[PDB]
């Protein structure tokens, strides 16, 4: 099946000083957002009609409560231990936790935390694992968090029992959107390159869903290995934009074409042909 294979929640907690911290959070299927976290209310925002998956309203509310309590307690505890942990304000903590469905059906769970934009800890086999970048501060943290009643057991349940059933339930509930096929549009442009008598050709591909795509500069059947792919960039409303570029000598651009393959095209690749002397 196509479309996203993972669900995860993220956290960004920004600590301004000893008395002021704020947290942003959200839930995601790969890079598609399906939950917001509303700090006005301490509740989740369900961005799609199927965003609750197959969970009951009661279970959804219980999880909102867990996250509400966690977000509040996390900042308080971090402020309380910032002295003992030799923390200098301001600092920002990030977290990601979730699970992913692999080829062959296994679901693998993960939890990672960061401080200052660098890895700090992870959870592996339901234990807190300090990351080397986190140094002795990370080791102190893991040694601390296991002393808190119920936290690691709640984390274990969420990661290894709740997340896999939620992932499966929401992949199914959202399949009409998650496995939809949207045909990309493609166009060519050109521009200068610093090489004497060389230019850069650009093949633009935009509006395709799902994310996997194949774009290559071609000479007939010959794939031009000099093709360079840009970043795959988002559009609003779940499609992407990608450019493929080729640096070529002036008198050798004739004969080039751009070929796009995508799951939505049902075998009919897009082929654009580069024409010379400003013939578009």
């Amino acid at each position: 099946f196509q479309g996203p294979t993972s669900f995860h929640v993220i956290q960004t907690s920004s600590f301004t000083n000893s008395t002021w911290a704020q947290t942003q959070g959200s839930g995601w299927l790969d890079d598609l957002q399906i939950h917001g976290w509303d700090s006005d209310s301490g509740t989740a925002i369900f961005l799609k009609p199927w965003s609750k998956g197959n969970f009951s309203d009661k279970e959804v509310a219980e999880l909102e409560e867990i996250f509400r309590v966690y977000i509040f307690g996390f900042a308080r505890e971090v402020q309380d231990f910032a002295g003992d942990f030799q923390m200098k304000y301001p600092f920002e903590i990030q977290g990601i936790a979730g699970c992913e469905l692999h080829s062959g059906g296994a679901i693998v769970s993960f939890l990672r935390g960061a401080l200052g934009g660098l890895d700090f800890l992870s959870v592996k086999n339901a234990s807190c694992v300090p990351s080397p970048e986190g140094g002795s501060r990370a080791q102190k943290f893991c040694a601390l968090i296991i002393q808190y009643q119920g936290i690691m057991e709640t984390v274990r349940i969420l990661l290894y029992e709740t997340c896999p059933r939620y992932l499966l339930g929401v992949l199914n509930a959202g399949k009409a959107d998650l496995q939809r096929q949207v045909k990309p549009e493609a166009w060519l442009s050109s521009g200068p390159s610093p090489g004497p008598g060389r230019l850069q050709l650009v093949c633009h591909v935009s509006g395709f869903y799902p994310k996997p795509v194949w774009v290559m500069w071609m000479r007939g059947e010959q794939e031009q290995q000099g093709t360079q792919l840009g970043d795959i960039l988002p559009n609003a409303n779940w499609t992407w934009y990608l450019r493929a570029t080729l640096d070529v000598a002036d008198g050798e651009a004739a004969g080039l074409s751009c070929r796009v393959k995508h799951s939505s095209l049902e075998g009919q690749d897009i082929i654009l042909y580069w024409r010379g002397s400003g013939l578009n």
Binding site: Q24, L115, G191, G207, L233, N235, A236, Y241
Partner: protein, 100 residues
């Protein structure tokens, strides 16, 4: 938890530009740390009011990213840009949209 990252600013239209035809202008701001940031889209140097943006997210290396966008109709002479301020920037950085 010490080195800041300056944002990467990429400005692109949803569809190939055609003067007089409605389009969408995207600004993807990425690679930055910390998360505090201010982003505007500009028309002819003036702040566009009706601009939507994504909730905060970050990439595998913990760098934050945001998508800002607005409906716009490109014309021959109008100029559009993405203006970003961040602690790593001495003054707002302006990246102009370049259809070619």
């Amino acid at each position: 938890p010490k080195i800041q990252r300056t944002p990467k600013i990429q400005v692109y239209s949803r569809h190939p530009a055609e003067n007089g035809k409605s389009n969408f202008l995207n600004c993807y701001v990425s690679g930055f740390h910390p998360s505090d940031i201010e982003v505007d889209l500009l028309k002819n140097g003036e702040r566009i009011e009706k601009v939507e943006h994504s909730d905060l997210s970050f990439s595998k290396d913990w760098s934050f990213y945001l998508l800002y966008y607005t409906e716009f109709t490109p014309t021959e002479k109008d100029e559009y840009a993405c203006r970003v301020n961040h602690v790593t920037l001495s003054q707002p950085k302006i990246v102009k949209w370049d259809r070619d």
